[PDB]
Design an enzyme around this catalytic site. Structure first.
Site, PDB file in Angstrom:
ATOM      1  N   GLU A 140      -8.874 -13.774  -5.238  1.00  0.00           N
ATOM      2  CA  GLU A 140      -9.195 -14.178  -6.608  1.00  0.00           C
ATOM      3  C   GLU A 140      -9.155 -15.710  -6.762  1.00  0.00           C
ATOM      4  O   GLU A 140      -9.905 -16.273  -7.561  1.00  0.00           O
ATOM      5  CB  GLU A 140      -8.289 -13.450  -7.634  1.00  0.00           C
ATOM      6  CG  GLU A 140      -8.700 -13.688  -9.105  1.00  0.00           C
ATOM      7  CD  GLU A 140      -8.446 -12.506 -10.042  1.00  0.00           C
ATOM      8  OE1 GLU A 140      -8.088 -11.391  -9.578  1.00  0.00           O
ATOM      9  OE2 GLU A 140      -8.623 -12.704 -11.268  1.00  0.00           O
ATOM     10  N   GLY A 180     -11.738 -14.218 -13.885  1.00  0.00           N
ATOM     11  CA  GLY A 180     -11.865 -12.975 -13.147  1.00  0.00           C
ATOM     12  C   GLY A 180     -11.906 -11.824 -14.127  1.00  0.00           C
ATOM     13  O   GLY A 180     -11.113 -11.772 -15.069  1.00  0.00           O
ATOM     14  N   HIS A 217      -7.293  -2.930   1.963  1.00  0.00           N
ATOM     15  CA  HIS A 217      -6.333  -3.396   2.951  1.00  0.00           C
ATOM     16  C   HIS A 217      -6.541  -2.586   4.217  1.00  0.00           C
ATOM     17  O   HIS A 217      -6.006  -1.492   4.343  1.00  0.00           O
ATOM     18  CB  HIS A 217      -4.900  -3.197   2.447  1.00  0.00           C
ATOM     19  CG  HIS A 217      -4.629  -3.833   1.114  1.00  0.00           C
ATOM     20  ND1 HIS A 217      -5.050  -5.102   0.798  1.00  0.00           N
ATOM     21  CD2 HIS A 217      -3.982  -3.362   0.019  1.00  0.00           C
ATOM     22  CE1 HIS A 217      -4.675  -5.393  -0.440  1.00  0.00           C
ATOM     23  NE2 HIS A 217      -4.026  -4.355  -0.931  1.00  0.00           N
ATOM     24  N   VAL A 218      -7.317  -3.115   5.155  1.00  0.00           N
ATOM     25  CA  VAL A 218      -7.723  -2.330   6.320  1.00  0.00           C
ATOM     26  C   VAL A 218      -6.836  -2.568   7.538  1.00  0.00           C
ATOM     27  O   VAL A 218      -6.819  -1.738   8.451  1.00  0.00           O
ATOM     28  CB  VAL A 218      -9.208  -2.568   6.695  1.00  0.00           C
ATOM     29  CG1 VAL A 218     -10.098  -2.318   5.501  1.00  0.00           C
ATOM     30  CG2 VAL A 218      -9.418  -3.983   7.188  1.00  0.00           C
ATOM     31  N   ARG A 219      -6.114  -3.693   7.554  1.00  0.00           N
ATOM     32  CA  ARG A 219      -5.184  -4.014   8.640  1.00  0.00           C
ATOM     33  C   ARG A 219      -4.045  -4.883   8.096  1.00  0.00           C
ATOM     34  O   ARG A 219      -4.258  -5.765   7.263  1.00  0.00           O
ATOM     35  CB  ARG A 219      -5.910  -4.734   9.800  1.00  0.00           C
ATOM     36  CG  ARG A 219      -4.988  -5.188  10.946  1.00  0.00           C
ATOM     37  CD  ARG A 219      -5.761  -5.926  12.064  1.00  0.00           C
ATOM     38  NE  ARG A 219      -6.601  -4.999  12.830  1.00  0.00           N
ATOM     39  CZ  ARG A 219      -6.194  -4.330  13.908  1.00  0.00           C
ATOM     40  NH1 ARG A 219      -4.955  -4.486  14.371  1.00  0.00           N
ATOM     41  NH2 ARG A 219      -7.023  -3.496  14.528  1.00  0.00           N
ATOM     42  N   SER A 238     -26.387 -15.498 -14.718  1.00  0.00           N
ATOM     43  CA  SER A 238     -26.219 -16.453 -15.800  1.00  0.00           C
ATOM     44  C   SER A 238     -24.886 -16.259 -16.506  1.00  0.00           C
ATOM     45  O   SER A 238     -24.261 -17.231 -16.936  1.00  0.00           O
ATOM     46  CB  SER A 238     -27.360 -16.309 -16.809  1.00  0.00           C
ATOM     47  OG  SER A 238     -28.610 -16.354 -16.148  1.00  0.00           O
ATOM     48  N   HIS A 245     -22.501 -13.632 -15.283  1.00  0.00           N
ATOM     49  CA  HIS A 245     -21.532 -13.041 -14.355  1.00  0.00           C
ATOM     50  C   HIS A 245     -21.848 -13.377 -12.908  1.00  0.00           C
ATOM     51  O   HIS A 245     -22.994 -13.677 -12.569  1.00  0.00           O
ATOM     52  CB  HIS A 245     -21.529 -11.515 -14.464  1.00  0.00           C
ATOM     53  CG  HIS A 245     -21.585 -11.017 -15.867  1.00  0.00           C
ATOM     54  ND1 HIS A 245     -22.767 -10.923 -16.571  1.00  0.00           N
ATOM     55  CD2 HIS A 245     -20.608 -10.605 -16.708  1.00  0.00           C
ATOM     56  CE1 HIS A 245     -22.516 -10.462 -17.785  1.00  0.00           C
ATOM     57  NE2 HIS A 245     -21.215 -10.264 -17.893  1.00  0.00           N
TER      58      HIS A 245
HETATM   59  C1  0FQ Z   1      -2.844   2.280   8.877  1.00  0.00           C
HETATM   60  C2  0FQ Z   1      -3.995   2.155   7.920  1.00  0.00           C
HETATM   61  C3  0FQ Z   1      -3.505   2.385   6.505  1.00  0.00           C
HETATM   62  C4  0FQ Z   1      -5.066   3.138   8.294  1.00  0.00           C
HETATM   63  O1  0FQ Z   1      -5.664   2.856   9.559  1.00  0.00           O
HETATM   64  P1  0FQ Z   1      -7.105   3.392   9.936  1.00  0.00           P
HETATM   65  O2  0FQ Z   1      -7.859   3.907   8.751  1.00  0.00           O
HETATM   66  O3  0FQ Z   1      -6.912   4.551  10.875  1.00  0.00           O
HETATM   67  O4  0FQ Z   1      -7.966   2.190  10.559  1.00  0.00           O
HETATM   68  P2  0FQ Z   1      -7.775   1.666  12.027  1.00  0.00           P
HETATM   69  O5  0FQ Z   1      -8.045   2.783  13.066  1.00  0.00           O
HETATM   70  O6  0FQ Z   1      -8.772   0.497  12.259  1.00  0.00           O
HETATM   71  O7  0FQ Z   1      -6.270   1.118  12.170  1.00  0.00           O
HETATM   72  C5  0FQ Z   1      -5.995  -0.223  12.090  1.00  0.00           C
HETATM   73  C6  0FQ Z   1      -4.732  -0.659  12.796  1.00  0.00           C
HETATM   74  O8  0FQ Z   1      -3.644   0.006  12.205  1.00  0.00           O
HETATM   75  C7  0FQ Z   1      -2.995   0.687  13.279  1.00  0.00           C
HETATM   76  N1  0FQ Z   1      -2.372   1.870  12.808  1.00  0.00           N
HETATM   77  C8  0FQ Z   1      -2.876   3.082  12.561  1.00  0.00           C
HETATM   78  N2  0FQ Z   1      -1.878   3.900  12.161  1.00  0.00           N
HETATM   79  C9  0FQ Z   1      -0.715   3.173  12.174  1.00  0.00           C
HETATM   80  C10 0FQ Z   1       0.664   3.487  11.863  1.00  0.00           C
HETATM   81  N3  0FQ Z   1       1.031   4.808  11.416  1.00  0.00           N
HETATM   82  N4  0FQ Z   1       1.591   2.539  11.972  1.00  0.00           N
HETATM   83  C11 0FQ Z   1       1.275   1.285  12.379  1.00  0.00           C
HETATM   84  N5  0FQ Z   1      -0.007   0.957  12.688  1.00  0.00           N
HETATM   85  C12 0FQ Z   1      -1.014   1.886  12.592  1.00  0.00           C
HETATM   86  C13 0FQ Z   1      -4.083   0.913  14.279  1.00  0.00           C
HETATM   87  O9  0FQ Z   1      -3.549   1.213  15.534  1.00  0.00           O
HETATM   88  C14 0FQ Z   1      -4.800  -0.302  14.221  1.00  0.00           C
HETATM   89  O10 0FQ Z   1      -4.085  -1.275  14.966  1.00  0.00           O
HETATM   90  P3  0FQ Z   1      -4.626  -1.745  16.361  1.00  0.00           P
HETATM   91  O11 0FQ Z   1      -6.143  -1.663  16.380  1.00  0.00           O
HETATM   92  O12 0FQ Z   1      -4.181  -3.132  16.607  1.00  0.00           O
HETATM   93  O13 0FQ Z   1      -4.077  -0.857  17.427  1.00  0.00           O
HETATM   94  C15 0FQ Z   1      -4.599   0.741   8.057  1.00  0.00           C
HETATM   95  O14 0FQ Z   1      -5.711   0.622   7.279  1.00  0.00           O
HETATM   96  C16 0FQ Z   1      -3.643  -0.339   7.606  1.00  0.00           C
HETATM   97  O15 0FQ Z   1      -2.598  -0.583   8.199  1.00  0.00           O
HETATM   98  N6  0FQ Z   1      -3.987  -1.101   6.410  1.00  0.00           N
HETATM   99  C17 0FQ Z   1      -3.070  -2.147   5.957  1.00  0.00           C
HETATM  100  C18 0FQ Z   1      -2.024  -1.673   4.866  1.00  0.00           C
HETATM  101  C19 0FQ Z   1      -1.288  -2.847   4.253  1.00  0.00           C
HETATM  102  O16 0FQ Z   1      -0.765  -3.733   5.015  1.00  0.00           O
HETATM  103  N7  0FQ Z   1      -1.190  -2.983   2.815  1.00  0.00           N
HETATM  104  C20 0FQ Z   1      -0.459  -4.132   2.287  1.00  0.00           C
HETATM  105  C21 0FQ Z   1       0.973  -4.048   2.471  1.00  0.00           C
HETATM  106  S1  0FQ Z   1       1.814  -2.575   1.830  1.00  0.00           S
HETATM  107  C22 0FQ Z   1       1.740  -2.633   0.042  1.00  0.00           C
HETATM  108  C23 0FQ Z   1       2.653  -3.726  -0.549  1.00  0.00           C
HETATM  109  O17 0FQ Z   1       2.214  -4.885  -0.680  1.00  0.00           O
HETATM  110  C24 0FQ Z   1       4.042  -3.396  -0.946  1.00  0.00           C
HETATM  111  C25 0FQ Z   1       4.678  -4.141  -1.937  1.00  0.00           C
HETATM  112  C26 0FQ Z   1       5.985  -3.842  -2.306  1.00  0.00           C
HETATM  113  C27 0FQ Z   1       6.660  -2.786  -1.694  1.00  0.00           C
HETATM  114  C28 0FQ Z   1       6.030  -2.036  -0.700  1.00  0.00           C
HETATM  115  C29 0FQ Z   1       4.718  -2.345  -0.329  1.00  0.00           C
END
Ligand code: 0FQ
Ligand code: 0FQ
Lengths: 136, 136
Positions: B63, B82, B89-91, B109, B111
């Protein structure tokens, strides 16, 4: 109650210390049977360059409340991460604290969806947000 | 070039002083002829309680970059706020700085729609975001 974890407000507020939640003085203020509520100041830490609450700060508040509420609806070593978040900035804020109120839209086995509404001190809606989480 | 205002990188970076952008060490690093780029640290100011970059912090970056690019595509006393934002959040990001790259999807114009992609230090996409602005 929707919660599966039992936690105190004090223990919940301790979670933010030394990370972004504490740095923005986000304070959880009420745990209801199916809602969670936190406030956040509108000041130099959360404003954009033209004196308004940063749209991103409202989203930090929403994702904080929804992710924590999400976590409280899991058990053991399950984790909850934000997967997709979206928000509409319907009114600006300039001073005081805003209040986020979060309720569940979907509590699934692998994903959750949370609604978070953020209000100013006059009780006016400023931000309407939806957060989708992934349960890992 | 898409810009209607002529601003220096130093002047862009001055805008963040005394507000959230400066507080988080968000730094604008490049103005392209149709892209804008800024970086943000993954540290105690931007992490969630479990050591990951807070998903809301990514949205602050998105943002911030999108609203400024939007402003640079207006003139005089026109304001840009905004209106709507969504992010995937993909990684997870865990350390170093992340880098947001912003491009226009639609410049209208009254937006704009901006795409902001946020990469970690290894160049992997971590957040993909879309910001809709209103020009006032
Ligand atoms: C794991 C998700 C959700 C799904 O993955 P997908 O759809 O299958 O897609 P991919 O296959 O491409 O996987 C990508 C990578 O993830 C890995 N991976 C897969 N499974 C696991 C696992 N069980 N454990 C660990 N890693 C795992 C994979 O091995 C791969 O790694 P690599 O290639 O290096 O080997 C993935 O999209 C992600 O981590 N998004 C980010 C979420 C985020 O950070 N949100 C913000 C923070 S939390 C909210 C907050 O702010 C908050 C505030 C206050 C309090 C509390 C919280
Ligand atoms: C699965 C979602 C998305 C996430 O929640 P979640 O936490 O992950 O999962 P939940 O625990 O909440 O259980 C939910 C249901 O999913 C099932 N199930 C779960 N895991 C598995 C599994 N591993 N394997 C098999 N099944 C599984 C459960 O049995 C349960 O089934 P049911 O409902 O019969 O009791 C859930 O919110 C949902 O279903 N949203 C509706 C989606 C929708 O209708 N979108 C629009 C239409 S599609 C797009 C379109 O238009 C289109 C156009 C052209 C071409 C093609 C397409």
């Amino acid at each position: 109650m929707i919660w599966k974890r039992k936690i105190t407000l004090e223990a919940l507020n301790a979670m933010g210390e030394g990370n972004m939640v504490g740095f923005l003085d986000i304070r959880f203020e009420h745990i209801g049977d199916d809602t969670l509520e936190a406030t956040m100041p509108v000041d130099s830490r959360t404003k954009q360059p033209f004196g308004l609450l940063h749209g991103g700060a409202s989203v930090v508040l929403a994702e904080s409340i929804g992710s924590v509420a999400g976590y409280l609806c899991t058990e053991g070593e399950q984790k909850v991460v934000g997967l997709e978040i979206n928000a509409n900035h319907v009114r600006s804020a300039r001073e005081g604290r805003v209040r986020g109120v979060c309720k569940p839209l979907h509590l699934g086995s692998r994903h959750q969806v949370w609604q978070i509404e953020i209000f100013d001190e006059k009780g006016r809606l400023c931000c309407s947000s939806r957060l989708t989480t992934a349960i890992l």
